[PDB]
Design a protein around this ligand. Structure first.
Ligand SMILES: CCCCCCCCCCCCCCCC(=O)OC[C@H](COP(=O)(O)OCC[N+](C)(C)C)OC(=O)CCCCCCCCCCCCC
Ligand SMILES: CCCCCCCCCCCCCCCC(=O)OC[C@H](COP(=O)(O)OCC[N+](C)(C)C)OC(=O)CCCCCCCCCCCCC
Ligand SMILES: [Fe+3]
Ligand SMILES: [Fe+3]
Lengths: 256, 256
């Protein structure tokens, strides 16, 4: 037996019991909740659901602000063992004629002392323009698509190419989408974001997200996950008769 | 109900986040909760889990005490369309030599004033000596056994014969059982009971349970479903060879 489980679970049951009483939850309402919970399980949506509403809060208490990069939620759509990307301009694996604007990402990884962290590896994943993640949609293959690991240069600089992510919506038709859209009368949209994980021997891992200035949902995240210090200027500076979105970010990691 | 799910959900959301913050639920803890929630779904256990922990409460909101017969939790094991019995001794359907002590039940269905409610139909269901309900066990036929419907005599009184229900265990190896037995370090035993549902034209439906004096689990019910007003004096008679156990209860109902 776990005293953690005992202390937390006994309190949690008193809490929910008080809620039931306080709000006068009826037998039908209880059945609806019982049935709704079941359908989340049947839709495979527990990760998506809990992350949509609560991962922000678990994120808030776990990691702090300071002179390092702020973390943000991981969400449910991360995947391990993404391919190391090297070459000319290192580029995220992409379908032929992947919809979207070519995006060029630059920046660095350093420590709270300004030292470049050459040991780091940066996982990056993001949605297709369709608002889908590889491995997590029936409309996409279970293959590393718009996912990959990127490594800094000896000087600490990083650089990759992809399509610029655009906003997306949690399936309106799933139990999560239903709750957010019908039942609550809100939306199920997230602002556009690049997910990031950086790990380096000696440093605390960083899981974070990079957002874009002017994004329509910047102040309306259905998942409650945006943070001002992770909102990025976008530049557009043509390369031979081709317009590129330019995004730059310098990551600072904490020791230990 | 758009407006009503908005109130409860937002309130629920604040409740859980506040819980997450105060107890500082970590990423690993959160992932464990998430895994457990999936567990319960992959078993057929949401109804069993919710009824075990929270139906006691939904119950005490739906009915409330008085000179009524005090209600009780239904549980996940009720079956609609049980057989209407009219034998002269009047017996629940059971297999030949159904193990366990024989039991005779008597009582009444009167209203508050004491006028017998002739239009009553009473569903009664309970476990085998082995701790299984028909329809909910491979060791039992998917047929009505220890399940039945009884109609009162025109003076109110009711009688049926059966076997004595005994304390049963919610399965040790299930996510719920695991929670009750392993992580919480308690037990998953319910005290002995007979389930009862009463319907009457122009009267409020009553769902409840009858327990037995002396039961080892009367004060440690795994489902917190016991009410002292609903535990029965049990007179133990030995009609040689076969030891009958006689019980009596007078059901009072509310009415529109
Ligand atoms: C709408 C009705 C609400 C229903 C919600 C259902 C949630 C109930 C989940 C119960 C948690 C069971 C965790 C398993 C314990 C365990 O594996 O112990 C071994 C290892 C080690 O696990 C741990 O030690 C992690 C400790 C986590 C504590 C979980 C206790 C439950 C608190 C309630 C959670 C709600 C707040 C997020
Ligand atoms: C980490 C902690 C563990 C997480 C806890 C798991 C979350 C529990 C499920 C919450 C989802 C609520 C169901 C939505 C109701 C619905 O979709 O149906 C809508 C209907 C009909 O629409 P027209 O509306 C109703 O009639 C019923 C209202 C139900 C209100 C929901 C309150 C949520 C509080 C849940 C806690 C109580 C148990
Ligand atoms: Fe995302
Ligand atoms: Fe039972």
């Amino acid at each position: 037996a776990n005293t953690r489980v005992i202390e937390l679970f006994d309190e949690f049951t008193d809490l929910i019991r008080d809620f039931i009483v306080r709000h006068e939850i009826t037998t039908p309402e209880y059945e609806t909740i019982m049935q709704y919970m079941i359908s989340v399980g049947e839709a495979g949506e527990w990760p998506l659901w809990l992350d949509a509403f609560f991962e922000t809060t678990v994120d808030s208490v776990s990691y702090g602000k300071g002179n390092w990069t702020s973390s943000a939620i991981q969400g449910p759509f991360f995947k391990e063992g993404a391919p190391l990307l090297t070459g000319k301009p290192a580029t995220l694996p992409m379908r032929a004629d992947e919809p979207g604007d070519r995006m060029r990402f630059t920046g660095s990884v350093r420590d709270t002392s300004g030292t470049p962290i050459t040991g780091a590896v940066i996982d990056v994943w993001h949605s297709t323009n369709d608002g889908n993640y590889s491995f997590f949609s029936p409309a996409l293959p279970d293959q590393y698509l718009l996912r990959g690991r990127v490594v800094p240069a000896e000087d600490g600089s990083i650089e990759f190419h992809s399509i610029r992510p655009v906003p997306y919506e949690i399936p309106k038709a799933g139990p999560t989408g239903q709750l957010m859209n019908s039942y609550l009368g809100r939306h199920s949209w997230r602002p556009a974001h690049i997910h990031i994980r950086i790990t380096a021997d000696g440093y605390r891992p960083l899981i974070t997200q990079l957002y874009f200035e002017g994004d329509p949902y910047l102040d309306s995240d259905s998942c409650s996950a945006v943070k001002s210090e992770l909102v990025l200027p976008v530049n557009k500076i043509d390369i031979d008769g081709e317009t590129w979105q330019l995004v730059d970010f310098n990551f600072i990691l904490q020791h230990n």
